[PDB]
Each structure stands twice: as C-alpha cells, then as structure tokens.
Short mmCIF file of C-alpha atoms and ligand atoms in Angstrom, two decimals:
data_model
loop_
_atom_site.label_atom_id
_atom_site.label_comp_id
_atom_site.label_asym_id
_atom_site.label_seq_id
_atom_site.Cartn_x
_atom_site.Cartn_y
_atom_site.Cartn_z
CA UNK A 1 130.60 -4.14 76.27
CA UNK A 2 127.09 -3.47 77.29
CA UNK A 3 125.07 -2.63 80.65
CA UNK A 4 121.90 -3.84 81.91
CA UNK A 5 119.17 -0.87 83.92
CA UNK A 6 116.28 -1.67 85.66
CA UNK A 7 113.61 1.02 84.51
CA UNK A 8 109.97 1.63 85.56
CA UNK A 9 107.48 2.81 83.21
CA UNK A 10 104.61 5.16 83.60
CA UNK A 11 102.38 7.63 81.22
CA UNK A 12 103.45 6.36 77.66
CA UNK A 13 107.59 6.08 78.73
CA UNK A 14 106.99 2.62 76.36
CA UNK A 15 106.60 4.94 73.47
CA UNK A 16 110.24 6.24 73.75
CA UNK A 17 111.86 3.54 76.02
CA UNK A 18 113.93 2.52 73.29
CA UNK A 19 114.76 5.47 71.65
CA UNK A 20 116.30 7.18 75.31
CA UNK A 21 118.61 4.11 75.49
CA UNK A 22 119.75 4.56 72.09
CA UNK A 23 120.65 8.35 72.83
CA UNK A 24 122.17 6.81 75.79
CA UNK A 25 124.05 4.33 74.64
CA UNK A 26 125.25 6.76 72.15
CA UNK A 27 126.26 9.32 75.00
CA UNK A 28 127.93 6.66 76.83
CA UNK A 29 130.08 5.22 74.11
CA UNK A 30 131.08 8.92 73.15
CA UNK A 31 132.20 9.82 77.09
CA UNK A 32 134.16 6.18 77.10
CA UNK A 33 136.00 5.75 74.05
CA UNK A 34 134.05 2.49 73.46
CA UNK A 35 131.09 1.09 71.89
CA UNK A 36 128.85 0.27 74.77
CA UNK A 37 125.19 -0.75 74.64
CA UNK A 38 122.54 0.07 77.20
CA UNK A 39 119.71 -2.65 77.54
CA UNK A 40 116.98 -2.06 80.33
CA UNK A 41 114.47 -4.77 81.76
CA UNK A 42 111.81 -3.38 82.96
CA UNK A 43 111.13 -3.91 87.34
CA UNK A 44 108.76 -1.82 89.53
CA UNK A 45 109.45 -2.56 92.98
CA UNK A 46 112.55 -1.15 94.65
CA UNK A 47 113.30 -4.20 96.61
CA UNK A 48 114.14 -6.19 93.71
CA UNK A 49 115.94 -3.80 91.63
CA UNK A 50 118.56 -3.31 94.46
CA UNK A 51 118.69 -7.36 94.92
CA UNK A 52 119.02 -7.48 90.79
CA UNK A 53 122.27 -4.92 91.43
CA UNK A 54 123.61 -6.54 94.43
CA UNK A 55 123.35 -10.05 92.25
CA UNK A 56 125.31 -8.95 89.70
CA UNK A 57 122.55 -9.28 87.31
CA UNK A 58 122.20 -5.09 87.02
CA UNK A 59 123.99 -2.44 86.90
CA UNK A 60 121.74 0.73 87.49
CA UNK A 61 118.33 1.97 88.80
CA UNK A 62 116.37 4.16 90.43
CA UNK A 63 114.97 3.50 93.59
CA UNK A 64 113.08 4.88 96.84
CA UNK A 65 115.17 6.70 98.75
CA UNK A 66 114.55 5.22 102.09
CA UNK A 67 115.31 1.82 100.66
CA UNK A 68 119.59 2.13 100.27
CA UNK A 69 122.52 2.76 102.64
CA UNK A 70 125.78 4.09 101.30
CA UNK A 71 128.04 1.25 102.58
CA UNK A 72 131.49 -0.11 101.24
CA UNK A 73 129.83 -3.80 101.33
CA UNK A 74 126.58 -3.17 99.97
CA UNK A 75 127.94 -3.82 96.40
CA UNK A 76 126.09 -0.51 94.93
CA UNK A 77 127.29 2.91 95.12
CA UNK A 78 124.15 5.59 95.64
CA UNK A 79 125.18 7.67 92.35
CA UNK A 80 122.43 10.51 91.30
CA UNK A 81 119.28 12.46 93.53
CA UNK A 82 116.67 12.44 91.46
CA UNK A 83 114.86 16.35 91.19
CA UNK A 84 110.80 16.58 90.63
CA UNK A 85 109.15 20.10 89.71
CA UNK A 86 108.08 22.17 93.34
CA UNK A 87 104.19 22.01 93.51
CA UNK A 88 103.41 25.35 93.79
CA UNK A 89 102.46 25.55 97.32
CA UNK A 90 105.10 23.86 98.62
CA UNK A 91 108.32 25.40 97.44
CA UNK A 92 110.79 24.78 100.29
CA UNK A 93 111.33 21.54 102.58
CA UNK A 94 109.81 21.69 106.18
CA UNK A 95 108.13 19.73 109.19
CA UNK A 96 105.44 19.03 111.10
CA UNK A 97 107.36 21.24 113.78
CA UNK A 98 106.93 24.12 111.16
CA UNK A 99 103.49 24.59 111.70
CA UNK A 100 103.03 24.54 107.84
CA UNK A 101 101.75 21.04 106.69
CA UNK A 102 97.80 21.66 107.47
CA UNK A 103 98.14 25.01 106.36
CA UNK A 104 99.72 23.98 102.71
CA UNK A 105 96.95 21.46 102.36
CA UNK A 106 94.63 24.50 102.28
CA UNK A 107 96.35 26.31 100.12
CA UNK A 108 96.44 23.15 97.76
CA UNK A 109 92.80 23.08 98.20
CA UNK A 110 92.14 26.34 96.60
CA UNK A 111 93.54 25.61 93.15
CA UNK A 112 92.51 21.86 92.86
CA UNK A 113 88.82 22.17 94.14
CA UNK A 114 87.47 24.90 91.65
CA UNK A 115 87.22 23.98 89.27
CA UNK A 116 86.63 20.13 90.14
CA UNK A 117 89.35 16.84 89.02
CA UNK A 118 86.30 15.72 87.40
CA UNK A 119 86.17 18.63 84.60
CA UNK A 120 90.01 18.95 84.26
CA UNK A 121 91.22 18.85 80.64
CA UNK A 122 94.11 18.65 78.72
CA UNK A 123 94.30 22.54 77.78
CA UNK A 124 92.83 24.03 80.17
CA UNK A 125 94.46 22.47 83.01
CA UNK A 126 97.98 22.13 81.11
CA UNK A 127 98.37 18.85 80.59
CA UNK A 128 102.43 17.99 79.67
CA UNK A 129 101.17 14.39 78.82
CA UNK A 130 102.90 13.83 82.23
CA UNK A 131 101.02 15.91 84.45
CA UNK A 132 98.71 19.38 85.18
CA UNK A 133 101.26 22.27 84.67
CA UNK A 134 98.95 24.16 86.75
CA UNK A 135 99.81 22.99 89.99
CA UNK A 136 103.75 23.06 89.08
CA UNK A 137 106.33 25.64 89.39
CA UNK A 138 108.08 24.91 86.46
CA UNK A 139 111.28 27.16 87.40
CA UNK A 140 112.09 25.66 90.14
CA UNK A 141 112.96 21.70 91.32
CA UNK A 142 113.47 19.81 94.20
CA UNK A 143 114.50 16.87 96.02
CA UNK A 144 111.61 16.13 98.27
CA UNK A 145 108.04 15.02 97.67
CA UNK A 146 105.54 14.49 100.71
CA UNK A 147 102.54 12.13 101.94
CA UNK A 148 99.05 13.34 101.97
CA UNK A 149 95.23 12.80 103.66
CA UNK A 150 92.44 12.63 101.62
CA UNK A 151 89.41 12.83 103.27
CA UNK A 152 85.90 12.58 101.54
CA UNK A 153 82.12 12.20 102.54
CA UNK A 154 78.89 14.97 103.36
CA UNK A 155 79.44 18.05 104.43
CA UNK A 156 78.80 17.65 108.15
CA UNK A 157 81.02 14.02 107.93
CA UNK A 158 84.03 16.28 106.82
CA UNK A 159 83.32 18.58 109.37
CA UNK A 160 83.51 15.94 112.11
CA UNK A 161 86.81 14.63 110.11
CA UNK A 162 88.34 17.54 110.66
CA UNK A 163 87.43 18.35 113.74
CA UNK A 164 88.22 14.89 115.18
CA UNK A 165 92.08 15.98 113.73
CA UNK A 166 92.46 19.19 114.91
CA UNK A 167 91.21 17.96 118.61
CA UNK A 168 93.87 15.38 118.58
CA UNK A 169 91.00 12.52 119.22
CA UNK A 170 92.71 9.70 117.57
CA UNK A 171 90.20 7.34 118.32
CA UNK A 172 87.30 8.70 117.24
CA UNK A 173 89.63 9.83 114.16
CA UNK A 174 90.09 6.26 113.00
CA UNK A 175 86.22 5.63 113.27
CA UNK A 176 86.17 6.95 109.78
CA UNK A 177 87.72 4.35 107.96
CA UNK A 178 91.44 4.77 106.81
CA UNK A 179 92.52 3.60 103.51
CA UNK A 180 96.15 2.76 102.80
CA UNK A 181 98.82 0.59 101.24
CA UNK A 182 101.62 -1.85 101.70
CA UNK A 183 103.22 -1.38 104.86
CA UNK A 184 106.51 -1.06 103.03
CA UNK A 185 105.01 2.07 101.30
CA UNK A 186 106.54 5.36 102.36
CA UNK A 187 103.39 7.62 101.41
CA UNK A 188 100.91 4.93 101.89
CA UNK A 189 101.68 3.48 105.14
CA UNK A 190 105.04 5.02 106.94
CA UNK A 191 104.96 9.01 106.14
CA UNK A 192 101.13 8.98 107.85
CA UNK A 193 101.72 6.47 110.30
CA UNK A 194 105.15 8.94 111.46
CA UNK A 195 102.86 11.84 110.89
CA UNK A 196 100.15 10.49 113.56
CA UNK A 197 103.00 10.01 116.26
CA UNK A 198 103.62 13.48 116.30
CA UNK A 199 99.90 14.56 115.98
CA UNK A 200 98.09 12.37 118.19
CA UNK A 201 100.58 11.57 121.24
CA UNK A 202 99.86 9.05 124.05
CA UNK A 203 96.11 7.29 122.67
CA UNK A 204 98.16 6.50 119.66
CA UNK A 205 99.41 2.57 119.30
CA UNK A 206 100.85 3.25 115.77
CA UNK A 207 99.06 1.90 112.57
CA UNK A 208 100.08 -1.57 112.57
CA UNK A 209 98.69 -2.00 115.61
CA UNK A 210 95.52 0.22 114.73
CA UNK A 211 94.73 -2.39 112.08
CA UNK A 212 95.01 -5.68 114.03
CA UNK A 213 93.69 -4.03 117.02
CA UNK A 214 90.42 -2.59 114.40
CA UNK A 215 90.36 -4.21 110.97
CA UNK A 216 87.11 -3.46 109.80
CA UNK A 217 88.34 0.39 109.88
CA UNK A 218 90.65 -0.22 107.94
CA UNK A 219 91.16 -1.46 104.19
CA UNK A 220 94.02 -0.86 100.98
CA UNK A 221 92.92 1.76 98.62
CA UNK A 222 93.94 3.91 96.67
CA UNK A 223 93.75 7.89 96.75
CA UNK A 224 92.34 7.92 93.16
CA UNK A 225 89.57 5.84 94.31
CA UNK A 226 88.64 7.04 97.54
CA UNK A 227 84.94 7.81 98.11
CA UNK A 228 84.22 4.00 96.12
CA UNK A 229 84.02 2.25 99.11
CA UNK A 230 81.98 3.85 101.80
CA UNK A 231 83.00 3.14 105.50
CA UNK A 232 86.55 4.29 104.25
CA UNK A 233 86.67 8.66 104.24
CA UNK A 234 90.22 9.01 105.15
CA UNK A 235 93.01 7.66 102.27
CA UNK A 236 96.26 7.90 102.38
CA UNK A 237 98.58 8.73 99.10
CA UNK A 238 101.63 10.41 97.14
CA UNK A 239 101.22 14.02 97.61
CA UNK A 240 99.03 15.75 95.13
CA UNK A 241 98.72 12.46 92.74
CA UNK A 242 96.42 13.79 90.76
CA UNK A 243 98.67 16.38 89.62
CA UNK A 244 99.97 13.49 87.17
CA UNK A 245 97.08 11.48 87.28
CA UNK A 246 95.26 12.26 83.68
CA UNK A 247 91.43 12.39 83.70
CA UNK A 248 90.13 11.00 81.31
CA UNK A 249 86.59 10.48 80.54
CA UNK A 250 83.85 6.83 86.59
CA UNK A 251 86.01 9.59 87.32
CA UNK A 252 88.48 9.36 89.56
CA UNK A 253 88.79 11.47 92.84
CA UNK A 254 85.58 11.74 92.62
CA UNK A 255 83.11 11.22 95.40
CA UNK A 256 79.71 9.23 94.49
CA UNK A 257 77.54 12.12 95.57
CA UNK A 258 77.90 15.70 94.05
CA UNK A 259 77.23 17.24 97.45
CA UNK A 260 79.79 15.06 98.86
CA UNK A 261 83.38 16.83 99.35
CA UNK A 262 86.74 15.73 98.62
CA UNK A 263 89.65 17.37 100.12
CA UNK A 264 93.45 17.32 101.64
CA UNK A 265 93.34 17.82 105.24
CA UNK A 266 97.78 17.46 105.48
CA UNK A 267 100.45 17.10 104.19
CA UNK A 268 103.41 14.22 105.73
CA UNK A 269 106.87 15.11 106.61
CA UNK A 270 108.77 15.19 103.82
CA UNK A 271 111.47 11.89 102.19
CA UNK A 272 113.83 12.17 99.23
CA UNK A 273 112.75 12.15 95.72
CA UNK A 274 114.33 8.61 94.45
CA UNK A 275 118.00 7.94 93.89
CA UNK A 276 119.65 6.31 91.31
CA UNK A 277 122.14 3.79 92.67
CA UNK A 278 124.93 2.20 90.37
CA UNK A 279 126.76 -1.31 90.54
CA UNK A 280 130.41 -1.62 92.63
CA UNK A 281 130.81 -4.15 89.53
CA UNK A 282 131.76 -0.67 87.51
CA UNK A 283 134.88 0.95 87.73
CA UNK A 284 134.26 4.61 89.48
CA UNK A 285 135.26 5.97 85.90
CA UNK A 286 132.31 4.60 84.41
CA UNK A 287 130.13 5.10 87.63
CA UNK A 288 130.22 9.08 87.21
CA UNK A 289 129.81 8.50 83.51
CA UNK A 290 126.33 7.08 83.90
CA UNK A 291 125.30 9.56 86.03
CA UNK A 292 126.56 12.87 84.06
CA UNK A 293 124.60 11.47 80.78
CA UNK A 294 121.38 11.37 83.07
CA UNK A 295 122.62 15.07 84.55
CA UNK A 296 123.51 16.24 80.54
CA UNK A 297 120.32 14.73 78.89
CA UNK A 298 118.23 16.84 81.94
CA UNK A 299 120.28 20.36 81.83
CA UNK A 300 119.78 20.30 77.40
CA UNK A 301 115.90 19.06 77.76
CA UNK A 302 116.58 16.00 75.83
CA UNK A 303 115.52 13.71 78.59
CA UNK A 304 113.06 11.45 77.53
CA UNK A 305 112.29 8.90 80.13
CA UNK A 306 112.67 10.91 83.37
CA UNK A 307 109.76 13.12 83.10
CA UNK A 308 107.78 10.58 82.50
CA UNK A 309 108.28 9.47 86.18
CA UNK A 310 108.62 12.74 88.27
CA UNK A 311 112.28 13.27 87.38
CA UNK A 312 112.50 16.85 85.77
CA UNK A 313 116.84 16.69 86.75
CA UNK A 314 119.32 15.15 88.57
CA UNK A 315 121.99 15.76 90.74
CA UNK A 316 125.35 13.79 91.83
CA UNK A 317 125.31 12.47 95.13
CA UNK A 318 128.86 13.62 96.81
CA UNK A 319 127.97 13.44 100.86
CA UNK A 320 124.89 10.28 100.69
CA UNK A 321 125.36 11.17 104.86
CA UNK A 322 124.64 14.73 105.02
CA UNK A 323 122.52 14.97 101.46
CA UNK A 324 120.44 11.90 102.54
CA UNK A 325 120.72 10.69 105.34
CA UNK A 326 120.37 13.25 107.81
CA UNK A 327 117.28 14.08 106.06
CA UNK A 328 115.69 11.24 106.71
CA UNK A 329 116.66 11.44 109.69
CA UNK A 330 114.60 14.09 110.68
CA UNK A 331 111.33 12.33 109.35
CA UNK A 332 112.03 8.99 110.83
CA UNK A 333 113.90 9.98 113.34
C1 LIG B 1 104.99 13.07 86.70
C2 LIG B 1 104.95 12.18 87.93
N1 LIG B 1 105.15 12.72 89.14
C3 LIG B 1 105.14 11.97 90.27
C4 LIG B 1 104.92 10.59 90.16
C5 LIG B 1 104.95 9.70 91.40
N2 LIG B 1 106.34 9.37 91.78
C6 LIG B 1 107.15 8.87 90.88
S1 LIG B 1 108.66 8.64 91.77
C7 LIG B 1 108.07 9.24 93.33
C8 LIG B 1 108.83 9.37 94.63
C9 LIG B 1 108.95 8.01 95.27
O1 LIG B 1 107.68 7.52 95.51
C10 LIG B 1 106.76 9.56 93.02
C11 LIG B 1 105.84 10.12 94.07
C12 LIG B 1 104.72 10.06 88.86
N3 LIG B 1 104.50 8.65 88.68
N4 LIG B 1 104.74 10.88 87.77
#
C-alpha cells in the first residue's frame, strides 16, 4: 500500500524532505500493521492541492484555512489545525473591535526597528535556520497568524501616512500607493481589504474597486521589497515576514534612503493557521492515523518538515464548525 501528500517547501525543507517521509512511513506502517509507503509531490498553491485530493490523485495536505468546508460531499475530511509559535506581542487572538491591532504594531516596532533588518544576523538575532527566535515566544503556540501594513518613505511622508489612517481619510490614504497580491491572497489582498471596511466606513468602495477605479496607485509587491518602487509606501503582507525571512548579505526591507523609515502601522484581523485536510478515499481508521504521526512527531521534537513552514504542532480537528468556522466568521463576517 502506499499514499501520495502534497507538500510545500520553504527554507532548506529539500534537505530533509525525504528523510521525514521515511520516519513517516515508518510511523505509519508501525500504527497499521502494514507496510505502507508515503510519497509526496511537491504543489504550492492551495487550490490545486484540494482539486489533487478531491481527484483522487492525493491523499493529504496542508492548506489555507479559508480555502475548505467540512462537508459530507466534498470528498476530504479537514483532519489536523496546524499551530505556529505566538510572536511575542501578540499572544492571544483579538479584533479590530479590541482596540489592540494599531497598538501591537507599535509594540512590534520597538524590537524590529533597533537594531535595523538590515544588520540582523544569525546569532545575534537567533536565527533557528527557520526564523529570528527573537521575535518568538517559544513556550507558547497558536492557531492564528494575522495581516500587516508596511508603510515606508521620509520622515514627514510617514507622518502624513499615518495621519491620513488615523483620520479615517481613505482617499487621500490610497494616494500613497498600495502594494499587494493576488486577490485570492488572504494577507495580501482580503485580511486588508476586510480591515479597511471597518476602518474607513462610507468613502470606502472596497479594494477591487479601488484598483479599477485608480490603477496607477496601485501595483503587486511584495513586503520584502517595499520601498523598491517609489510611488508605492503602503504594502501589504503576512504578519511579521521577516521574522522568517533570513537576511542575508540589496537588503531586503530596506528602504533606498537611510533617512527613510520603514514601519508597521497594523495589524489585520486574525484567520487560522493552515489545516491539513485528508482524502474520504481513506478509511476513518487510517484518517486519524495520519494525523496522530504529524501530532507524535511535533509533541517528541522529531518533526522535520513542519517547522520549516510555520508549523511548530498540530492539533486534531473534532468540531471544524465551532474550531474553524465560527472563527472565520468573525473576520469575514
Ligand atoms: C517559519 C515560517 N513562518 C511563517 C511562514 C509563512 N506561512 C507559512 S504557512 C502560513 C499561514 C497561511 O498563509 C504562513 C503565514 C513561513 N513560510 N515560515
């Protein structure tokens, strides 16, 4: 017998890709009574992993968690929550309606500023090979990750950034230049686009419309590059990415004058940290079994492949409605 996963690689997962699915394998065969082999291809976007599973041509993968339904016809079963190490200033799971999102920005400010990305090194700033441990607390995971801001430019330019934000002046907001990603991208599109609704109220047309309505403030990049193209000081990314973004020496989140700032001005609502969904192709029996030997390999530290990618543990998955859904719910509405 033998199973097929659809896997995503990131930092040097490549090295040990082979290896994990050995261990795996192994696992598997010893919680089943049979020799079973675990082959992987590798995929990147969501979309197509779940259409791989729901072809029959997969049997397992990880996936955003905004992408899946837990429905008796969808021929996949959402089996495992993914857990990511808490940043340190953002411990516990909250809302715009908390007050708390501009406020955590700041306080993310103060430890990545001084001293600057650009000087960040493997020792001092506690490199894991996966990511700064600095910015981590390492007791402690959870299930959520966030959206952020990015704004850049002179002094005076982020002082008209932010005060076109906290005035609610959406507008003259936009005249910066706003940087994002696919429109199918929770933390580069839909997390700031949701975020705006509830910041900027009526003058707001929503960010699809923004961008036909304005292109030329407007373009895709990325938060590791912001500050490259001038006419575009606001970007949009994953919360904190430079956390596990390794600098390595231009620099990236780096502006192209010293005297130039870079800064978060907010953090998103927040979504679920990916799930791993499993094929109705598999008895229930072996369903669980996949997903304890992801949950074993995590609780004894001999995970090799999930840290890689942001997932420090898993979880099972017993109420997708009340664990997941409801969640989302209160993002997205
Ligand atoms: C160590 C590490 N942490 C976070 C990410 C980014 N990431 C991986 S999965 C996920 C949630 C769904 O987008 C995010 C933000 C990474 N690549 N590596």
């Amino acid at each position: 017998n033998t199973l097929i996963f659809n896997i995503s690689l990131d930092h040097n997962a490549d090295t040990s890709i082979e290896k994990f699915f050995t261990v795996f394998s192994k696992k598997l065969s010893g919680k089943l009574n049979k020799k079973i082999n675990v082959n992987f291809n590798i995929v990147d976007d969501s979309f197509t992993k779940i259409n791989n599973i729901q072809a029959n041509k997969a049997d397992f993968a990880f996936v955003n968690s905004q992408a899946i339904a837990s429905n008796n016809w969808f021929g996949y079963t959402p089996l495992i929550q993914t857990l990511t190490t808490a940043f340190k200033e953002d411990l516990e799971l909250d809302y715009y309606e908390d007050g708390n999102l501009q406020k955590k920005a700041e306080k993310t400010n103060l430890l990545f500023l001084s001293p600057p990305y650009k000087e960040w090194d493997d020792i001092k700033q506690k490199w894991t090979g996966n990511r700064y441990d600095f910015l981590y607390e390492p007791s402690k995971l959870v299930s959520f990750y966030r959206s952020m801001i990015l704004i850049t430019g002179s002094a005076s330019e982020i002082t008209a950034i932010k005060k076109a934000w906290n005035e609610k002046n959406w507008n003259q907001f936009m005249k910066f230049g706003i940087g994002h990603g696919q429109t199918n991208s929770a933390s580069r599109f839909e997390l700031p686009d949701l975020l705006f609704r509830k910041h900027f109220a009526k003058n707001y047309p929503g960010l699809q419309n923004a961008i036909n309505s304005d292109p030329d403030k407007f373009a895709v990049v990325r938060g590791r590059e912001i500050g490259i193209n001038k006419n575009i000081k606001i970007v949009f990314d994953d919360a904190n990415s430079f956390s596990w973004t390794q600098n390595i020496k231009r620099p990236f989140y780096t502006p192209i004058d010293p005297n130039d700032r870079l800064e978060i001005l907010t953090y998103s609502d927040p979504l679920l940290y990916d799930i791993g969904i499993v094929s109705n192709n598999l008895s229930r029996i072996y369903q669980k079994a996949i997903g304890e030997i992801f949950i074993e390999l995590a609780q004894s530290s001999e995970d090799l492949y999930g840290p890689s990618i942001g997932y420090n543990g898993y979880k099972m998955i017993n109420d997708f409605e009340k664990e997941v859904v409801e969640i989302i719910e209160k993002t997205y509405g």
